[PDB]
Design a protein around this ligand. Structure first.
Ligand code: B4F
Ligand code: B4F
Lengths: 118, 119, 119, 118
């Protein structure tokens, strides 16, 4: 299922628990960027997905602050769980750093992460 | 405190949110049409210790478009920053992903931008 | 005709463009500071036969940030639509990719939005 | 080099010619969506890239109109050429359809395409 420990192509670690209320909770450890150790995450997922083989929609957020470090930024991942012999979560993400109004144009990075339980 | 409250977008969407000292965002998102039928759980995070150099406050949240009235089999995430002022604002970009077949994954994700203003 | 002309964004960026009957966009993009040093080639495409139902006109263009004065080793693409009116507008979202190492590819692409208005 | 015939994970075909003026020209054939046969493309690329092993930045546009069909939309790809034993062009793209102002919120799809010469 969705619950468990996941890894992306960057080697970052995504540990998540999916509740029946549609809630996501857990921790995220980034391999790259201004991050150290684990950060809190929370999100949502569709608790009653379709049955036509479609994926299960979900999303979550990490604010890159912990007791170790503060990168003044947040990332949201938006994607879906796909079932199969090899289960994976495909996402696209938006990473926004706090900026002055003059610098807002360079506030937001975009990318794509594919997660697996390897 | 600054983030905590009710906010509205231009298209008519509203949300109410509470920002905890632990960096948690929790509340409810309501779509353009004002009814209970269009109220959904909102959950996210924020920088509880933003910089002091004039920068905005980074944040993000998620709404899965399922409630006790309906299920659209999708979710939206907003990633942006809070900008304080006499008229405070939250400037975001968002990603809406719907459940799809692997074959239709390429058309699974919409992207847009929303600016919210505080009541 | 409607697209053909000079356009300006809020941050001060301007571009001049010509729309050919073949669906080609060609012109020059100038960054916020008004000098020759900041003028770059613009190239793109557009729907020369848009729908008649009130929809906007789909378009897109690219600027590689290299000219005879400087090279930032990057490129931006704008994808949006033209909206005719007394005050015509082009509403876009854009992607700016810089050349990176495979290791830094994850931080290679910025995303944003710009609305241009016609002079 | 960049010039040549390329294919993405969707099986779509990307035939491109890179000029020394920084210009891109060619044709694109989509495997998916409201497309038939070939459509014109044009774009730009950095003609004098760095030497530190960094990729070469580029972008291009396709308006989904030809003599066969009109999908009232346009796609722009933004990414970079990466050199190696297996050369590829990694992109992210924005696909905007013409819409009413009320429907602009659902005007723009986003995704990622990886191209190779296979
Ligand atoms: O450090 C963090 C938190 C860790 C994020 C980990 C991510 S979340 C998604 C992904 N998945 C995962 O598991 N880990 C990563 N975030 C904030 C830091 N932001 C950047 O590193 C950043 C942002 C913007 C730029 C940036 C720029 C920064 C400043 C400037 O003046 C111009 C810039 O121009 C750019 C142009 C581009 O095409 C791309 C980026 C920039 C740069 C940079 O170039 O070093 C870096
Ligand atoms: O047909 C074309 C031209 C071919 C594009 C080929 C692409 S270019 C990038 C990629 N790479 C490549 O080689 N080929 C593809 N484009 C315009 C058509 N757009 C769509 O197919 C489209 C756009 C939006 C929606 C859409 C919606 C459409 C209508 C509506 O009322 C609500 C919609 O909600 C959505 C929610 C989502 O999360 C995702 C999509 C939608 C849908 C759909 O659901 O069928 C479909």
């Amino acid at each position: 299922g969705i619950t468990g420990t996941w890894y992306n192509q960057l080697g970052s670690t995504f540990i998540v628990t999916a509740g029946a209320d549609g809630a996501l909770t857990g921790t995220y450890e980034s391999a790259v960027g201004n991050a150290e150790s684990r950060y809190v995450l929370t999100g949502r997922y569709d608790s009653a997905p379709a049955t036509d083989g479609s994926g299960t929609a979900l999303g979550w957020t990490v604010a890159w602050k912990n007791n170790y470090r503060n990168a003044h930024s947040a990332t949201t991942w938006s994607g879906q769980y796909v079932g199969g012999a090899e289960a994976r979560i495909n996402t696209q993400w938006l990473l926004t750093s706090g900026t002055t109004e003059a610098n807002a144009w360079k506030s937001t990075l975009v990318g794509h992460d594919t997660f697996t339980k390897v």
